[model samples]
Target chain A: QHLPVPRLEGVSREQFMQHLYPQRKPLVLEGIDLGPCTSKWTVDYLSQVGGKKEVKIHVQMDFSKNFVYRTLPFDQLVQRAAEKHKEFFVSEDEKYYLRSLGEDPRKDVADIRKQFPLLKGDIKFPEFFKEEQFFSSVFRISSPGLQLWTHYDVMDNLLIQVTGKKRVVLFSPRDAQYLYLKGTKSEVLNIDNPDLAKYPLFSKARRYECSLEAGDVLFIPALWFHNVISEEFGVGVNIFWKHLPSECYDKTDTYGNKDPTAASRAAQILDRALKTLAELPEEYRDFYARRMVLHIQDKAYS
Target chain B: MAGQHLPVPRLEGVSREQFMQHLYPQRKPLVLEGIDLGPCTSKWTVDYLSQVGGKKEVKIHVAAVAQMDFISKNFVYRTLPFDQLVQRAAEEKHKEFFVSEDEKYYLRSLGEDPRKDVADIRKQFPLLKGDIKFPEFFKEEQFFSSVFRISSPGLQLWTHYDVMDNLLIQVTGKKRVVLFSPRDAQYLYLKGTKSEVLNIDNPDLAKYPLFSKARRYECSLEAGDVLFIPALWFHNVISEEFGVGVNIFWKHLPSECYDKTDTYGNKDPTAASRAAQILDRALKTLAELPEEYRDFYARRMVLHIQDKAYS
Candidate 1:
C-alpha cells in the first residue's frame, strides 16, 4: 500500500530548517508565497515571453518505448504542450516535456536566473536553504498525462509547482533494492503495475505518493527516487541545493547525478573485494563470499 | 594516515530530564561528569573492597597477556573469592596466580543462574550495591542488568558492541576507551558482535586495510565519570590502572525486540538476527552457480545492500 507524503501549511523557514529538513523525508509544503508566477505564468504569457527561443522537447506516445528528443520553438512547444492539438512529432496524442538547460551544457549548471531571466523574476525561490548552498534552479514544463521515468538525484531539491497539478511517486533510498536500480534510475518503469515476475523485489518497496497543486512545494530529499506524472500541463521550478558539505559532491557534476565521493569509493572497494574472491575455487569462493555478505550485513547495513 | 579521530564529548551536571529529552536521542557516546554517584568513588578502595566486598566465589577471566582476545578465547575462566580477586587485580605481581605471576584478572559478575536470570548488583553483591547509585534516567521496568566489573592494570577488552544501552560507571581508577561509530562497522571487520581487529590502537593495516577508515572516538574515564555507551556502538576499553566499574544496561527499545535468551545483553535484536539468518540462506543459494556467476551475483547483492540497507 502507498503512503501519502505528509502535507503541512504555513511552515516557517525556521520550522522547516530545524525540524523537517533534518528528517530528510519527502514533504508537501503548502501556503508558501510563490510570487506572481502562480497567477501570471499562463500559456499565452509563457508563449509571448518565452518567444521563438529554440528549446529541446521530449515527444512520446508511451513511456514504455521512451521519449524521443526533438527541438521546437518555445512558443510553438508551449501551444502544443498546453492545449490538445493534432500537430505532433510522435502522434496526435503525443506527450511533451521540457527541461531547461544551461547554454554551455558541459560546464554550466541549469539556473533560471541565468538561463531564463525573464521567467525567473515571476518566481521566488524558497529561502529555507542558504543562497550559498544553492546548486541549480531548473525550469520544467510537462504535458498532461506525461509520466517521467523514476530516477534519483544526488542533490536535495524542491519541486515547486508554479501552475497546474502533478502527481509524484517517491521511493525511499532504503527501498533501492526493491526498485530494481540500474545506477541512479529504476528499471521497473511501470511502477503502478510492475512486472513482478521479472522484478519480484519491486513489490517490497513502500511507495510514498503526493499530489502537488499550483503554488505547492514538494521537498524531495537527496537520493530519493521519484517518478512524476503531470496530472495537467504544469510548470515546475526545481531548486536543487547541496544537502551535504560541499566537498562531499563531485566538482564536475553539472546534473548532480554522480554519487558522493565516499560512496563511489566504497563501491569501488566492494568491487575489489569481489574480484579478490574470484581467485578461490568455487567451493572456497562460495564460503568466503557468504562470509563477506554476512560481514556486510553485520557491519555495513544500518 | 591516522584517518578521522574524534573525542567523545564530555558534559558536566547533566540532569536526568536534560539527558532524556536532549542527549539520549542523539545516541552518541558521551562522558558525563559531576553526577553524585554516592560515595563509591572514594570508598571503593582495594582494602575496603577486600574487607567488605564479601568472600563469595566469583568467576573471573585469568589471562597471561594484558590484551584478552575473546575471539580466540585467549583467557581462561577461573573461580576466586571476591576479596582475593580484588586484592590480586590491584597488585603488580600476584601471590596466588592462575597463569603467571603477572597474570591479569577481569571480573564480569554474573547471576547465580546466568541462563535464566540477569545480573543485578543488589542481588549479587548486596553490600557493594549501597555504595553505587545507577543513573535513574531509564524506567525501572526497562532495567536489564547491572554488571560489576573489575580489571587489572593495562588489561584491554576486545572491541565489541552491546544490544542494550548502558552507562559505564567508573567508580575508581582510570580507563582509556576507544569507540567506533555504528556507521563505521564495515571498517571494523566484524566477525560477530566483536571486531576481528584486536589491537585497535595499532591495527594491522595490511590484513585489515578498511580498519584504517574507521573513525576512532576516544575518551578517558576518571573516577566518578560515567560513559554513556549507546547500543551498537563498538567500544574497546583499556584499564590504565586497576579499576572497579559498574555497567548498567537497560532496554532502549521494547523488551520484545531483544533475544529472550540473551542474559549478556550482547545478542543482536530479534529482527536483526533473523535478517542475518536470511542473508546466510541467500548466499548459500548463490553457491549453486559457477564461480564467475556467483561472483557476479554476489557483487549485485553487495550493491543492493549498499543501496538499500545502509542508513
Candidate 2:
C-alpha cells in the first residue's frame, strides 16, 4: 500500500546538486565508492581499531523495558553488539546501539574525522556538496532487530551503510499532518502495528521504503521522517550538510537538531497570533481560525 | 474559463551552461529567446529557400481543412520538391492544387528510409545545415534527430506526444504551440500517441469531456525563438504564418529505455510496450468468462488499480 523510495544508480554529482536537490525529494544513491569501509571494515577489524575508548551507547532493556543510557568501552560495545551476549539489560539476550555524539553531546556536532581519528582513515565519507555547506558526520552501529523511532532532521544527510543491512521506512515532509508529531519524533512509534483508532490519519501517510545493503547510501533530505530497522548488525556513517545557507540555521545550534531560525520565528509568530485570537468568544475564534486554516490551505500550498 | 491555460516559462539569451544547469533540471516547458541561431532566421527567405533548398523530393501532407487529424487520416500524402513545397506552403492560397486551390500544405521532412533511419537535418540536408544553428543544450552523443517541418498558414497539426525531448526552433515565420503535461494524460482521451479529439479550439465535449480538466501550457514563437519540449508532453501546433521550424530530438532517459527500431522517435519504451502487450493478453484471458463474472472481475481490477497502484 506504500510507495517505494526512488533509487538512483551511479548518480553523478551534477545530477544530484542541480536536479534532485532542487526537487527536495528522498532519493537513494548507489554505486558510489564509499571506499575502504565498504570492503575493509568487518567485525574483527572494527573491534580491534575501535579500541577501548569510552563511548556512549543505547541498550534496549527488553520488550517490556525502556532503553538504558550506558557508556561501554568502544571495543566491548562492538563485540557485544556484533555478537549475541548472555547477560544483557533485561534478560540473557540484549541489543546495543551506538549513535555517535559531539564533544558536548548537546551543543557540539559529531564528525567522525574529528571525534574518532583512528576510525576516520577507514571511512571515505561522501563529499557531494561544498566544504562550507558541510555540517557534521555521524558514525552509527546498531545491533540486529533494533528499530529507531520515526524522526526528522533539520539538515540534509546521507546514511552510508558500509556494512550489514537495514530497512528504512520514510514519509514525505508534506505528510507531517498524518504523523502525530510531539517534537521532531513521531508519536506513532510502531508503524507496522499502529493503534488505528488512536491514529486514524496514519493510514493516509504513504510510506516510502528501501532495503540497504553494504556500500549503499540513502539520501535523506531535510525534514523527511525516516524509521530505520537494522536487519542485521551494521555500521553506518551519516554525513549531514546544510542544503540552505549557514545563516539560515540557528546561530547557537552546533548540531542540526533545531529548525531553521526563520521557520522557528514564523512558527512562534503564528502561535502568538493564535493565542491573541482566544480573546474573542470560543465560536468566533474557532470560525476565524478555521478560515485562516482554509486560507493557508489554498494560498500557502500548491 | 472551462479549460486551464498555464504560462510557459521564458528566458532570453540563455547559454548552454545556463540551460543545462538551471532550466533543463526543471524539466518543464520553456521558451528560449534572443539566442544566436545563425543566418537561417533572416537569410532563408522564400526566394533563398527556393534557390538554395535545391530540387530534392519530399513527402508532404496536403489537406483542405486547417486542422490535420493524424488519427482519422483526413489529409492525403503527396510528394513535392523541397523548393516547391516551401514556395507553395508560404502562400495563403495555392495557385497549383493537389486536391483544392485553398488546400493547406505541410512538410514534415524525413530521413533516408524514415522507417529505419532517424532524421538528422545535418545529414538529410547537408547543404542547408550551414544556414541553421541548433541549440547546443544537450550533449552531442545524446542527439537523436533534427526534424525539418514546414507548414502553411492556419495549418494545425494533431495533438500528440513524442518519446524524445526536443527543441522546436522557429527559424522563420510565426507558430503557436499548446502543450499538456504528462500528468493530465487521462484527460486527453489518448488514442495511441495522438489525442482522439482533433479540434482543440472547439473540442468535442461529449466524447472528451475530461479535456477541460487538463492544463494547457501555451506559447507563441516568433522567428529565432526556440521552445524546449520535454519527452511525453502532448503538444498541438498551429502556424499563425507560413512557418519553418526545426525540431531537434535527443535521448533523455537511458538508451535501453527506447525502441531500437523507432526511427521517427515516436515508439514507447520497450518495457512499457511489453507491459501493454501483457495487459492485452490479460484482457483476452478475462474474455473467456461469462458476462456477469467478467464484468465483476473487470470492475474489481479497476478498483484494485485505483486504490493500490495509482500514485
Candidate 3:
C-alpha cells in the first residue's frame, strides 16, 4: 500500500492555486473549507493544546540552547526565541562575524518540553480530545512582527489566523534547487536570500500573496514554502497532526528473521519503508530491524 | 610620459574564465605590498593627517538612509556642527545599511574627500596636526572578535572571494563584538524579510552556523596573541577602549572549506563526485539569486567592491 499523502479539503484546486499559489509564489492549489482550521486554535488555546503533557510538543523557542536538538538543555535558551536558528544569516559583509561565537546546532529555539506547563492549561486543550486521531493543539504567536520565513515542512499544517494580517509567500516545490534543502532533515529548507540575478526564473514563479485575517483557514499543502509575516500584533495557531490512513505502514509482519544480517535486510525510501514494515513476517522483526538499523546508521551518519 | 591609455592595471584586462570562476568569490585578495597612494591624497601625510578619526580607529559608515554605497548624504545626514572628529565610511560593502545620526559630530567615521588636503587636513584635524601616516597605533585584543568597518568611500579596497569566509584582524582595540550567523537573515530587518542584508549581529545564535560553539578568546595586543576569526560568520562591533591594528583577511586552509582529503581519501574518486555535487549546488544557488531584483544589486555590490582598492 502507498503511504498516505497529505491533503486538505473543500476549496477547488484552482482556488487553491489562486489563493495560495499565484501570490506567494510557485504553482500549487489553494484553500480548504474547515481545512484552514480557523476556530481550531486561538491565542489562549495554544499553550494547552500544544503543551507537552497532553500532546507532544514538536516546536520550540528558537535561540535557546536546548532547542529541538536532543542534546541541548533548556536553561540556556535566549529570550523571545521562538524562531532563531543557525542557518539564519546576519548580513553579507558581516557574514563572518557570527563565527566569533561558535554556533550550536539547535541554537536559538525554545524547547517545548520545558514550556509544556504553560502550554498544558492553554485554552485550546479541549479541541484535541475531540475528533482528531492524535491530539491537535494550536497556539498564536501574539508577538507582533514575529516572522515565519519561506519554508515548507513535513506534516499537513492548518493555520487559522484570528488577529493580524499576514503576507504569506508560497514557493513552488518545483524550484527545489533554489531552496537550500535540508542536507539532513527532511523538514528543513534553506531559503537563502534569493539572488535574483542568478535565479531569475524565480521571478517567473507563480506567486500568491494573502493578508489573511481572523476567521481565515489557510490550508497549506505539504512541501510548500510559506513566509508568514504579521502586519501588526498577530494571534494564531497551527495544527501539527496528520491523520493516519488504515493499512499504511506495517500491521501484520516483520522481515522474517529472529536476527537478520545486513544482506538479509532491505533499503527503503518513503514507499519502500511502508511496504517493508507492513508486509514483513512477524518473526522477521529482528532481521528487518537489524538491516534497517545498520543501513540507517550508516547512511545518516555523515 | 605615459599617455592617456596607460595600462590601468586590471581595466580592460580581458575577463577571463578564471575571473568568473575562482575570482568571483568575495575574498579575491588583491594585496599591493607598497603601492603609491601619493597620487590622489598626497597631502594625506603625517602633517597632513586628517584627525577625522581622532584617536578612534573605527567609524560608522554614514552614507545615507535609502542607499548604502550611494555616496550621497541624505536629509537624514546629521547636520550637527562639523566637528573634525566625526567620520563617514564611504566604502562599506553595502551602502544601504549606512546610518546618519542627528548628532553628526558624535557620529564617528571618515570617507575620502577630494576637497581636503594635507595642509587643509592638518590645519583642521588634531591627529594630522604634526605627524600623520596611516594611524599606526597597533592595538590588539584577546576576547574581541569581529571585522572592523571598511567603509572608506573613494578608496578602492581590493578583497578576494572564495568558499572560505574571511575575518578582519583588529590590531588596536579592546572590544566585545556582537555576531549574527551567516544564516540568520530574518532577525535582521534593515530591509524587507527577503531583502539581502548587510549587518550581522551574533546575538541570535539559534540562527547562525555552529555559533553556539563560538569560543570568544580575549588576548590583548600588549599580550601579543594574534587574533583570528573563522569563515562564514557575522559581527557587530564595539570597543572597550581605543585601538589600532593592521587587519589582514586571508583565506583559510582548503581543509576547512571542504574536506578535500575525505573526498579523494582512498582513491575511489568520491572527491570528483563530491566536487561535482557542490559545484552543482553552487551553480543552482547562483541561478536562484538572479531572479531577486531587476538590477543585479547584490552582484553589483560585490563587483563595486571588487573594482576598487581600499588603501
The candidate scoring highest on lDDT is: 1
**What is the C-alpha lDDT profile of model 3 across B92-170, one tens digit per residue?**
2432232433211113223233123111223234442333232211222211111222223222111111123332333
Fnat of candidates, each listed = 0.02, 0.00, 0.00
Decoy 1 TM-score against native? 0.55
TM-score versus the correct structure, for each prediction: 0.55, 0.51, 0.26
For model 1, how does the per-residue alpha-carbon lDDT over A1-302 read when each residue is reduced to its tens digit? 58999999989999999999988789999989989989899999998987798887878134356678998999998888887578887777777789988888789898899877788888888898998789998889989988678998988889999989999999877676677667777887767887899988998888999999999999998878899988889788998998777886778788988866555544555555445444433332443444456564543344
Q: How close is each model in CA RMSD to the real structure?
A: 20.1, 22.9, 26.0
DockQ of each: 0.02, 0.01, 0.01
Off by over 4 Å in 3: A1-135, A183-193, A197-201, A241-302, B1-311
Worst 10 residues of 1 chain B by lDDT: B288-297
TM-score evaluated only on chain B, model 1: 0.97
RMSD of 1: 20.1
Interface Cα RMSD per model, in Å?
Answer: 14.5, 23.3, 21.9
Model 2 fnat? 0.00
Better of 1 and 2 by lDDT: 1
lDDT of 3 by residue, A63-143 (tens): 222222211122111112233345322312111100001122124212222344453333232132124433233444533
Clashes of 2: 0
